[PDB]
Design a protein around this ligand. Structure first.
Ligand SMILES: *Cc1c(COP(=O)(O)O)cnc(C)c1O
Ligand SMILES: *Cc1c(COP(=O)(O)O)cnc(C)c1O
Ligand code: NA
Ligand code: NA
Lengths: 392, 255, 392, 255
């Protein structure tokens, strides 16, 4: 390989032999692209002229009242699509094209990745097929309509426990046979090399912009940058550019679900065991005898039963710290943002916010400059929050 | 490892090809599975390729995918698999037994420990579906230390660098899944690769004979067997009958 | 008055005597504000740091294939809130504050204005009460949740035909008594002076940005700028800055509903009679003996049974042209944008797009540079479009 | 216009205040409405303030708002209102009749044409609820040309510039809705404004007397009457009875 498939001990290419050629092809293309200024220019054009970059960095006004905390939000919720996923899906789409591909393959759970791949495909004129867990289909009707509306073919998968987990299998099976004409657009900074690396490089503008914005507004770097961790793209997007600024703390927040002690959570990085799944060796939710288990979170977007290998690594060496936030904590953070700043955040992003609120409330006289990555908007969540609250 | 070398030798004197059925351990039940394996062997199977139910077989098709679900539902666990394995060996001392695993099930309790127990129960080879040659070092070495033959898949899109690697690293046999197939067998033989067994879609006697003639040392019947089980999941007595016959057929066509 | 309440013959202050003091106060404050560079700076900060301005100007890629039309979209759909309404609601909110007010009054139909006032209030820390037609309430549950979530008090009005029409009455009645502490945040560039003027000045950045963006990208002004007309704020927002560039055509699109000939439409400017309602003299939907009638459109956002007086004026003198687009035409424009550019537009904005598509299709070899104001995103509409299509 | 001047003169010789009830034309029915008006007059009403059902009375309360709905439901139209009006006049030649309108109903068929028909049916004054003095020019002039008294509301928040304007422009009477009210009556009298009638919340005899004493020329009973109709919407015979009494009371308290 041209690049290192490993971050410390995590990463690698744990896939059937049949897929190595495809991965090797992809890495070659990405490397050439990276160096192609024309590529970089095209990418930058779309992000800006189509997606809406750079996103704003909002200084919270009411939420930190009575404390010495200054809270800023990276407005990824303002991105076309309403989530950070759009940035890399455009990069990947542009990449498939450079490789002379005309078909895209994707899988989805909550639906945001399906929607984002569908939109990238529609715009760049690619045929798009999306594998979906029939369980997720049933509960993500709205996302299915969006996808179809955009001319993406939605293939419902039932095999096993019709979910992302299984979605991924068919997606991978498909690609084995079609990699010649099709490109697999993986949803996060996970899976086999070079996806963890690619997805990162295509999400790193978040962090690069935050750095410039903060220096302009505060004239100093933040004390910490906080982001939620489903699979890890938004997080590494944010973190990437600050890794060498050792004075800046990196905090990734995993879904605590009902609470760790209950077992019903989605925090493999801190509460799981390293294993081999999805073509990578990383921490995951698995049974004692090695069967991969499901994550749990009020937010469907944080349902990845494992985590990107770069994160597992950053943790290992102590460069970044990982914490968990429960359903209940996320929900209060949700409501608090609405009420005080009139911003409806994704229940995903609420996990990062909830943690920052914790920092502030516990040590109210501690002076600290924080930045929370508001990865998405919560429009998609009002029904959930609704039926939770009414129920209560 | 020894068992394969023995098998392929005997096969040669009788100038015939090896017939290797694939089955899922504990599908559809433990005793039903055991009863099935005894039939396959009695019906003429030269060797066995056995699968351990795994949660995420990103390398298998719906046929095998459904087999696992049945096993799981049956209450099969790796641990139970190993018990079955000691039992199979106990009754059939000479038959080569290969395992089809997923990297996690192997990595779970330490790699070495995995192969240790294989050797202990009398397993001859192991195929880790999701470990390309590029990442096989630890698995290979551990296999060799416990006298276990590490099986490797040789794909259709296999280039020359891969061919040389598969030849060097593998033992027992080569799992054969553009390239004039005749040239594949050729290149392998040339590289002193372990005897190649034709694995892609072998579901009719016609195919067994072809493989042999093409230069393969035999053929692996990947899912044809799992199908029969499914088809007759309803009726057991006929599940066996259908099994006996199918195997007898495939075997006859190897001579 | 400090300013002219009239545009030609349309406009004025047709309100009970009791409200004149409030209107006079408001106009004085707006005039001072306009001249206050500190005011301008504060406003500009919020628009940019909180709302996301300037919005992008996207050049369509696939939709104009096989024609000599170049189609650009003013991405107001990318504004925090997902509609253009946010711009003026912030201006008004900032204004209430300058006047020393601490309460806001608003009314809503579809709900977008309620939501926008609620968000502006939450952020600037104002008490907010929103009058809503119980008919609209029942069908705008989601918008009601958003509003409540944001700490706005939602007062359901039943009086008459519980709708905007009646909402406005209670809103106005409330203000008569409370204008001392409260400010009425009218939803469009209509009603009594100085609202038509205020709302315009607070929406004019759309047009000013479009002008700069287009000169940068094409090096020439557009042939025409197209926007939908519910009440007229997005339209005048777009038009305002191009009024003196006589070479630029101004096209406002009114909802044709089921079709003019059916009577079931919402196009008063072209198919109604001038009258006196909502404190202004302008064209409106009225019966033969003068009773004000309801508008009709698939899009609830275009339901204002009258129109801003500046529009009626621009028409009169022939500076701008007004056309209508039917439900069916809007729906196809909806679907077409999804499919080819992977943008989900508001059913409102679809009326402007549908018209531009018409221009292009009718005269495919006619070279023209068009700009459509994409006033909002269609997330709020997928259910409507859904149940329409499935029904079909 | 003449009728008001006549009324206020007579009232003076008898040193009493005017009692003016408000009602919605055609509420709850046309004949029921006509029957109601005949009672109000017979019961002692000095004048009448009549409303024409309008779709959007952004200047009225729920009490009046509901009156309009009833009329509408009854099938009342402006046109029908004017028929009723000719009829009321036909039977009651001296009673001053004022109309409470909304600017659209007046503007509809041309302003002048509106006042023309008023004069024709024998209407004395018109109050356009949504036309401030600032926008009254056309309405005023048209009223004066057709010898119609243009009534103007004098609000609580009324400044001096407004006071002078209302004094100059109005006729018939001044509709009285901080400022020591005593000073209001004072300032108006000083400006030679048309006799002021107290309109805000006059629902008890106590209030009538107060108004008079305060210097008002009488009081308008804004919605108290509409209430009775509503309360007894159920039973008509009692609707009238309740009406007779209430009016008789309010009237007695003006002397
Ligand atoms: C999908 C999603 C996430 C989770 O994904 P990552 O790969 O962990 O970054 C978080 N937030 C939003 C708004 C999302 O859509
Ligand atoms: C409210 C709305 C409109 C209609 O309002 P105008 O006052 O006519 O500009 C149009 N588009 C969107 C997206 C809206 O929310
Ligand atoms: Na995870
Ligand atoms: Na309109």
């Amino acid at each position: 390989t041209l690049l290192n498939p490993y971050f410390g001990e995590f990463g690698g290419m744990y896939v059937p032999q049949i897929l190595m050629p495809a991965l090797n092809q992809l890495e070659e293309a990405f490397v050439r692209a990276q160096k192609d200024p024309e590529f970089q220019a095209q990418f930058a054009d779309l992000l800006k002229n189509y997606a809406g970059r750079p996103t704003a960095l909002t200084k919270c006004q009411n939420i930190t009242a009575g404390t010495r905390t200054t809270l800023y939000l990276k407005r990824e919720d303002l991105l076309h699509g309403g989530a950070h996923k759009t940035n890399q899906v455009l990069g990947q789409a542009l990449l498939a094209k450079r490789m002379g591909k005309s078909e895209i393959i994707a899988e989805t759970g909550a639906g945001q990745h399906g929607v984002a791949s569908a939109l990238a495909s529609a715009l760049l004129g690619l045929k798009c097929r999306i594998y979906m867990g029939a369980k997720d289909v049933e509960r993500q009707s709205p996302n299915v309509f969006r996808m179809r509306l955009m001319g993406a073919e939605v293939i419902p998968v039932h095999s096993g426990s019709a979910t992302l987990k299984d979605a991924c299998n068919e997606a991978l099976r498909d690609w084995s046979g079609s990699y010649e004409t099709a490109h697999y657009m993986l949803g996060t900074a996970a899976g086999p090399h070079p996806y963890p690396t690619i997805v990162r490089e295509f999400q790193r503008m978040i962090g690069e912009e935050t750095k410039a914005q903060i220096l302009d507004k505060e004239g100093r770097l933040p004390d910490a940058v906080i982001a939620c961790v489903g699979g890890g793209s938004n997080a590494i997007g944010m973190f990437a550019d600050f890794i060498n600024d050792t004075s800046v703390g990196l905090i990734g927040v995993e879904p605590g679900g009902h609470g760790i002690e209950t077992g019903e959570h989605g925090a493999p990085l801190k509460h799981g065991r390293v294993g081999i799944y999805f073509g990578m060796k990383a921490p995951m939710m698995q049974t004692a005898d090695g069967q991969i288990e499901e994550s749990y979170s009020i937010s469907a977007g944080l349902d990845f039963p494992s985590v990107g290998p770069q994160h597992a690594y950053l943790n290992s060496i102590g460069r970044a710290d990982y914490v968990s936030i429960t359903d209940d904590e996320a929900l209060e953070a949700f409501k608090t943002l609405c009420r005080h700043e009139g911003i409806i955040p994704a229940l995903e992003s609420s996990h990062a916010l909830a943690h920052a609120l914790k920092m502030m409330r516990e040590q109210p006289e501690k002076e600290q400059l924080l930045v929370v990555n508001l990865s998405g908007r919560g429009d998609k969540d009002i029904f959930t929050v609704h039926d939770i609250l009414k129920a209560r | 490892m020894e068992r394969y070398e023995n098998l392929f030798a005997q096969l040669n004197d009788r100038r015939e090809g090896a017939f290797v059925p694939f089955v899922t351990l504990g599908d559809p039940g433990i005793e039903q599975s055991l009863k099935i394996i005894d039939t396959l062997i009695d019906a003429g199977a030269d060797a066995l390729e056995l699968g351990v139910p795994f949660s995420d077989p990103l390398a298998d098709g719906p046929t095998i995918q459904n087999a696992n679900l049945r096993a799981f539902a049956a209450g099969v666990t790796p641990a139970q698999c190993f018990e079955m394995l000691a039992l199979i060996r106990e009754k059939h001392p000479t038959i080569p037994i290969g395992l089809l695993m997923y990297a996690n099930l192997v990595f779970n309790n330490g790699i070495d420990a995995f192969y240790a127990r294989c050797e202990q129960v009398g397993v001859d080879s192991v195929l880790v579906a999701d470990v390309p040659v590029e990442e096989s070092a630890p698995f290979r070495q551990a296999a060799l230390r416990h006298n276990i033959a590490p099986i490797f898949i040789c794909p259709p899109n296999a280039d020359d660098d891969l061919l040389r690697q598969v030849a060097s690293y593998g033992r027992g046999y080569t799992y054969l899944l553009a390239l004039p197939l005749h040239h594949l067998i050729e290149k392998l033989k040339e590289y002193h690769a372990a005897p190649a067994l034709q694995g892609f879609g072998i579901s009719s006697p016609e195919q067994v004979s072809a493989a042999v003639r093409a230069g393969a040392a035999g053929a692996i019947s990947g899912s044809a067997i799992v199908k029969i089980i499914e088809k007759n999941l309803a009726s057991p007595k006929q599940m066996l009958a259908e099994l006996r016959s199918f195997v007898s057929a495939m075997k006859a066509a190897s001579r």
